Every structure is written in structure tokens, then in C-alpha cells.
RNA sequence: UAGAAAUACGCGUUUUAGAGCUAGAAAUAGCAAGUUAAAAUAAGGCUAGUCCGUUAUCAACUUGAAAAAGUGGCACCGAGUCGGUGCUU
DNA sequence: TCTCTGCTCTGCGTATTTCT
DNA sequence: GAGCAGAGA
């Protein structure tokens, strides 16, 4: 009557089993609903549930951020058009309308087809004058003529739209650091400051480090050659410590700045008051040469002086492209005239036409064309340009990502400065346009929502619409940054209503420095028994040792106190340098407010906003130091548990006990685990949907699906056996490779989940009556149990192994707890306060109680019988598919009606569009369709695919949507929603899973008997066993006596494939390759048949390789066959079905 | 060592614009040119925000707007995917 | 005109921050 | 899985 549930949770499967107390699996007749004639079906209580893996939110978040990026870029262009509109409406009123209409075909445009000037002659004159946009940008930067307003708009919009990166914090400017000649300013500044004053010996300047990856080994000898080595560090030539940041905060070379500790390049190069700016410019030349090195990595050489180096570089790139194109065309005309057509006309060969007009990248084009250049001659400069990857480049490439926004800002500022005198409105709001260019939303403000986003946290000061200009006076930056941090910090596990402290909080140090010291003992000559440190002794070691050394260290613990962390305290005592104000605890709440602020915020002026209320306590220079100190890391527990929770025994919260208990020292965990002290019931009093009850819990997104499916499997399995509760549930835990780590995460909470949902009734004497022992096992035990008693799994044949593993889980679990009852508290979850050889006398018992726990003999027979069962409930979970509407690439225009439009008014016979849509779920319809030249209603019944785009419009009103598809007189009740992997049964018990509206999938399972899978495991692993010798030699002799098993395996494959797979050509190719290869050795034959079971695999058809050939898979490319089949509606365990005979409809 | 969120960048794809010329009933053939720009980048939605739109959830049936709740007898002998036999309403 | 066989097609590279 | 074209009716 009693039973036990075995489970096996994976990333794609949940195997379940139900055993009775003699390890037999029961079977029952289950009721069949539906209009079929079969009314009751016998089923075994063992099976598995397979599903697609759950996906992370990663791709969704990336596409959401991309959506917001494109929205904000379009808003930038709209702001710029708003600024320009009033004046631009006097020279070309339809201009912005033409730019909007530019995508449309010649007929769909309302205005003339030439966007910029609106006629052919001015447009072609413009394109001959400025071949690229960069010619126009350089012309507007350099020339001083009054330009046409439209060209100004194109230039400004081209910088505002494609504005480059923001990774450089400073004021990067290519108006002083164009060329690498900074030696004169650097050396003259050095010799103006210093006395002995060496002089230049090599002018290589930045081009030394330009040629290599950064290292001391590059720059040391080069700076010695540049400048003779009077000062091996601090020569103040171009050197790595001044050019490039140092990650450790090592002291400076010389006491010009008190040996200031070095940092990376940041805003801290503007403020260095503590050691440099208040005590001592060389560093102006240093940052100038940093500008020099980085621009020389990104900007080519400029011999002409100009305010637009990037546009000049792009013009140079264009001109060299033109010259090498002309030279290459002449060379190919002269020496290889037959290749000219292939190179310059054929746009599918990765030639020049395929690189410009086709889809070949620069790398592919170079790889194609380089043998052509090498076999020719006169190509030397082209070959070396190709070797430097600077042959026939394009102005817009993958390498433009290194360009910082300061260069575009300089060019835009130069254009506005030149052209402001002719257009007054350009001068009136130059700051507005620059603000449009340079504004970013801060990463701590997040989306600028109005309470309709589930991601936003922004708090706005005023009901105004946010814009780049009014941003500062509309968003409360302080509150928004605080909310940006506070939403991520987690509550403590003991009281989920108070925010935890920073790790550098002083109260957390009065936890920390005495918590470890509480359970340390001092054992010496002074007494005969070990004693904990007294509170007075703890205070003494703190005051002497820990108040001079941050880190606990047992060597100095010995040789400091007994022969005679506080890092925040030490730093704050080397800043304020007053021990009184730190030892003062009366004022400590304001000090924790300071600690909280320096933990929350990193942008410095926000630090000033939080510190304004404390200016009266301290002088200004130490607030400037406070800007430079930053705290990271958060504490593990809350302020109420720190101090607030007064006890009823001593007036001593935990940290008061850690400070001073004298003897009988009690640690944090013992104090909170104690109930006789009034902390445990406080934790108890401190404490309606399973979905939320797992949502905020930790876990990989894949495994959480498996856990929820496991819980629903347990619920339905309990429901199946008439609400009688189990007494054991066995769970996978491979704790001490993604599978290993994901299965180790599982048992942090699944045992809690099952124990909470299972055990729910209690009494007054005990607050839970333990009725289900939640067993938990490691896969190692089931592994040697499999490999030690000839029950081998092979994963390639069938999905029964999941259920088989579940069965093994249950049997070894129950047989272990019955064998060692006293070891419940090691494995049973719910009650704990902190081997395998007995399976190998024939009858084993607990002994302390005479119950039989294992019977070598009938038990192994029962297990063999269960593994040899043919019927195992495999159920593929039907899911409505969700995700992207279609594949992402935009196919060119075609005269096909399968192209999906990109927009409402973009007919995809003129504009192209997407292909390969994804069906959410198919829908069986039965209606009349007007087929035939003579329009007359033939009744039809066919499947239809409802794609993800059409899903909402279908569920809004199915009848109108189907009538729009052409169907007439749709039988509304007869509409059947069929998700993916909907299961159908056909003749001879041949099942098919519906992969889509127009494709099927294989559905049956080859239930190969246990002797053959044992043989195949013993064969395919032929000389890789590494066990006891005589055992593997008798296994060798066993596989040697049984070669005929191979031939009967092939008959099984032929029979199953002739019954269910219906792939004739695949079958006799397999048979012919077998018959022509029957003489090969056993290992290769058995391994190739193990690949050969892919023919009979559940799921999609897939190609597979034999000894000498790959056999193409037979795809089932139509669903006409299932419209007269038995559709099966399987429950989650698959025991409850609902068969619909579709042939009786319409 | 990974999950989850935010702010940005560079490409890519698509259609249009960048007058192709000559010899020709041409099917065409010779020759020149090629680097750039606009717009879109899930269709779209309404609370109209510089917001949201690809994560999670989901067998069937009966109630319920929804949330949700409920609905399927047992033992034994066998096993080609479950079959048979015997009690019970 | 409506179903089968055989072969081809498929968005990408980076950053800065967070919290766990 | 879908797409596409090229044959069997």
C-alpha cells in the first residue's frame, strides 16, 4: 500500500518513478477521455518528461538595450531637426520630409526622388564635389564661407547620429597633440624645473610605444637611448609610468609630490590635492603625450595643420583607395586580362565587386586577392599595404569603434564656430547642440520612465518632460542613485525588512574583530584548563594588536601580547588622526551615515551633495580627501541584528557579548541558535504562490524550469494514487563542466521546497510531524551500482534511461535508509544538527530490527525485470513557441508572397523583408475554401500555422482572422489549438510529434532489451575499463562469445524502422553497408551501431556516419498524414490522456 | 565562477539617392564607375513615457472575467510500447 | 495544377558600470 | 525548420 517516489532532475528532463516497499513498480488501468472507442489503458508508474531547455534573459536584455539605443538616437535627430526647423523652413520646407521619404521607392515618394537638393543637377554636383560625407565635414571645418544650411545639417546630424564612444573621461583634444613632437615641451619643462638638466638624444617620441604592446621592457632601453640614464625612473622623457597608468598604488619616483601613489587615468588626474596639487607643469605634458600616443594609434599622420584630423584621415583613406584601385585595374588589364571580368564585375566571388557590391568583408577580400597580387609583379606597394591591412579600405569599418566622441565634438564645435556669424540661431543655441551631442543618461539613473516600466527606478523632481538640456533640474540624481544601489543590495536571511550594512560599516567591525577572537583560546602555564579570552583581554588585544595591524595573524598574536579586522578604523585614523572621535560611540550614527554615503556613491559631486549637511564638523581639505576614498562590499546582516535587538537576559546583543563575555565566550551563530537567550524566537517572529516562492531564490534559469516541473510531477503523482502521501522522495545531488555545477546548485533549495509543500500539518507538541523522509543522493552511488551489477546505461539508444535513473535513485535510496535507519540525520533533509558494499550473506537486514532490507536474488531479478520493461511513459512537453518574430536577416526584394513586411506600408515586393517566421502554435481548422477557376465551396480540413506576429490578432478574434485567410464557414467549436510537439498516433502504433504546421517529428521509442544494452556498453568500451584485470578479461571473453547479438540488433533496427520510421532508402543503405562490412572488428562495429541508433532516436531526424558514409536523414516534410489520426492529449506525467479521433470531425 | 539590471559605441542587412557611355532589332558585346548618405533595425501598443514589445509561465475537460478550484476504482498473471483474468458501482 | 527529392541557408564585434 | 527549385502526377 505504501510507496516511494524517485526523481531525477536535469536541464532537459525530469525522470520519475513510483516503487512499492519490495521495489516493484505497480501498474494501473487509467481512464481515457475523448470520442475514441478505447476506454481504459494499462500503464506503469514510471516515466520521464522531456522539454526544451529554459533560456536566460541575456538576449532579451541585449535587444531591449538596442531598442532603447535606437529610440534615443532617433530622439537626438528629432531634437536637432526641432532646432533647425524654423530657419530650414525658409530655404527648403520639404527637406526633412524628403529625408524621411528617402527609403521609399520612386512612386511611393510624395516629393522628388533626390533627397538633399531636390533636383538632379545640384545632387550630382554635390556628389562630385564631396564624394564622401567627410569631404563635406572637412570643408565645413576649414573653409570660412557661408555654407548652405542643408549641408550644415547633414554634417551635424552625421556627427550627432554616429557620435563615437565615451570611454575617455577627460577633455581629449586634437588641436594641440596632432603630431608626436612633445619632446620640446616635456624636456624644456623638466629642465625648467630641475637643476642638472639633460638634453635630447633620440626623437622617436611616441612612435616607439606605438610599435608594440605596452611594457617596461620596451620603454626602458628606449628612454635610455632617448635621454641618458641619470634617473632610471623619472627621467621625464616618454616613460610608461607617466604615459600609462599603474594598477598598484606604488609610490612616485621622486619627492616632487611626496612620492604620490600612482593611479590609472581617470578624473583623479584632475584632483591630486593630497600629495601633488597642494605640495608642488610636467603632468600637462604627460597627458599631452598620452593624447599623442592614443591619437597616433587611431589617427594617421597629419602633415597639414587642420582642425578636423579625422575627416582629413578619411579623405586620405579615400584618395589612397582611388589610387590603388586605378593601379590595380591597370595591372590586371595588362598582365591578367582574363581575370578582369571575374575581379571587377562578378559580385559573388569575393573579388572587388564582391567586396564593394557583394557581402565580402575586408578580410575575405584580402584572402581572395592576395595570391593574385603575389603572382603578379609591380605590386610591391600594394602587397605591403595588404600586409599592413591598409589596401583599398573603406571609410566606415569595424575599426572605427576606437574613435572617442571628443573628436566629433571638436569638429562640431569648429563648424558651429565658423558658421555662427552667418546664421544667428546657430550662435544662440550652440550649447544646446553640443549638449545633444555629448549627453548620456547616467548608468545609475536608468530608463526615464513615468512609472510604467518594470525596470525603471528614476525619481523625478518635477512633472516636466525630460530633455538633455533640462535634465539636471528635473531628475533627483541623488534619490535615483540611491534607489539604483538599494534595489540590488539584498536583505539578510534572518530579518527580511531592513537593509544590510556596508562591509566597511564600523558596527560590522564590532561584529568582525571580536567574532573570530571570541572562540580563540589561550592555553599556557597560568592554568590547568583552556580558557577563552575575557572581554578585558579581548579589548586589550584589540587595543594593542588590531589597533596597530589590520589583519589577524597568529605569529604576531603569539609574539606581541603573550610575551608582553579594523581597516576602516585604521584608514580613518590615518585621515582624521584623532583617536577620540573614533573611540566615541555616542556619535557613531552620523559616522555610519558617512560610511553609507561613501559606500553608495562614486561620482564625486554626488558625494558633496550627501556631505553638505556635515560641513560644520570638519574642515574643507579633509572633505576633499573623503572624495578620494571609496568603499566597496556589503555586509551579510542587518542593523537590527547589530544593535537593535535587545535581549531579556543580560541587556547584551550579540556584539555586546562578543565585546565582553569574560569567560564562557559565546559566538554569533551559537547566540542566534539559542532559544534560552531570547534571539531564536525573535528570528522566528521575524519571518501564496510557488512561482514567487522560487522566483527571488537563486538558481540558473535552465534548472529552475526542471525544479518547477519536478514539483508538478510530484503533485500529479500524489494525485494519481488517490491522495495517499508518500514516505520517501529521492533527489539528485552530485555535490562534493556545466552539468556538474547546475546539478550542484539544485539541492540548495529543492529539498526545502518539497519538505515545505509535502509536510504541512502539525500539532502543539511538535511544529512538524515528519511523514516524508526527503532522501537526497549523489550520482556516484547510482554510478557504481550501475557498473557493479551489470545494469549499464547507454545514452544513445533511448530516453528511458532518465526514468531508469529515477528508478535506481528510488531503490538505492530506500534500501539505504532501511539498511542504516540511524543515519537519517545525515541524508534526510529537515532534521539535522550540524558503505556501498552491502549489496555485494545473501539476505541483508538492519539487525537491530529484524526487517529484511535487501535480498540478493529476487531483488536483482525484480530490478532486471523493471529495466527490461517495454512501456515507459515518455512525454514531450508541448510548448507554444515564443521569441523573435522571424529570422533577423533582411532578404532582398523578390516576387514572392512569403516575404514578411518590415513595416505596415512597406510592401515586400519593392522593399524586401524577413523570412523563416516562427509558429507559436498550429490550429486545426475545418471550413470551405474557394478553390478552382470556377469559384465554388469545397469543404476542406487542414492545419494552419499561427505565427508569433499573428498570435495576438488571432486570439483577439479567431473567426475574422481565419476569414481574412480565405476560409469560409469556419466551425468555431472544431478549432483545435495544437502547440509544438503535439502527439499523434497513426496505424500500427506509429506516433508522430507535430514539429510545426508543415513538419513532423519522430515519436516512438525503441525499447531495446537489457541484455543488448549491457552487451553494447561492454563492447563499445572495449579496452577502457581500468578495473580488476580478470573481470575485464572475462568481459572480453563474453563479448567474444556473443557476436550474433550484432546481427539480431540489426533485425531489431530494421523491424522498428520498417514499422515506425518508414525510411526505406536509409534502411537498405544501412543494411548494404553492414553486409559489406561484417568482417570488421567488434569495437568499431559496435561504436558505429551506437551512432546508428540515431535513425531510431526520439526527436528530429539527423544525419549520422557509418564506417565510410554519411546517410542523409529522411525528413517528414508534410502534415497531411496526421489529419486523420488519433490526437493524444497527455498530462504532465502522461498517465492521464485524452484521445481525440480527428477523422470524425468535418 | 556564473546569473540579473543599466548606460554607450562600431559594423552588418534592406530600399532609395550618387544622370553610366559606345556599337547596335538584340539576345547583347566592349569600356568607364565602384569607398558615401537618408531611413528602418523585431509588426507595433497606449497609461503617450526620451516608456513598453524575444526571459519566465502553459496537456484536456467542468465551473470561474481572471486568479484559481475541481474531474479519472482495486488485486493478480504476464510483457513489442501495454495485454489478459478476477471483485466493485 | 498539387505533391515528393535533393540541395542550400542561418547578424556581429566591443566597452563601462552594477549587484548577488 | 524553412526555403527553393526541379521533377512525378
Author numbering: 3 to 282, 288 to 571, 590 to 712, 718 to 766, 918 to 1015, 1042 to 1047, 1061 to 1366
Could you share sentences copied from the article?
We then prepared cryo-EM samples of SpRY in complex with the same off-target DNA substrate to visualize how SpRY recognizes this scrambled substrate. It was clear during classification and refinement that this dataset contained conformationally heterogeneous structures, which we separated through 3D classification. Within this ensemble, we could resolve four distinct structures, corresponding to 1, 6, 8, and 10 bp of R-loop formation, where the 6, 8, and 10 bp structures contain mismatches. Serendipitously, the scrambled DNA sequence contained a four nucleotide stretch of complementarity to the gRNA, located in the NTS outside of the typical protospacer region (GCGT). The mismatch-containing 6, 8, and 10 bp structures align with this region of the DNA sequence where the first four bases of the R-loop are complementary to the gRNA with subsequent mismatches. As observed for Cas923, we observe REC2 and REC3 movement in the 6, 8, and 10 bp structures as the R-loop propagates past that structural checkpoint. This phenomenon supports a model where the REC2 and REC3 domains must be displaced during R-loop formation to accommodate the propagating gRNA:TS duplex. Our mismatch-bound structures portray an ensemble of possible conformational states that SpRY can adopt during target search. Without PAM specificity, SpRY locates partial target sequences from which it cannot readily dissociate, nor achieve nuclease activation.
CRISPR-Cas9 is a powerful tool for genome editing, but the strict requirement for an NGG protospacer-adjacent motif (PAM) sequence immediately next to the DNA target limits the number of editable genes. Recently developed Cas9 variants have been engineered with relaxed PAM requirements, including SpG-Cas9 (SpG) and the nearly PAM-less SpRY-Cas9 (SpRY). Here, we combine structural and biochemical approaches to determine how SpRY interrogates DNA and recognizes target sites. Here, we show that SpRY binds diverse PAM sequences by forming non-specific interactions with the phosphodiester backbone of the target DNA.
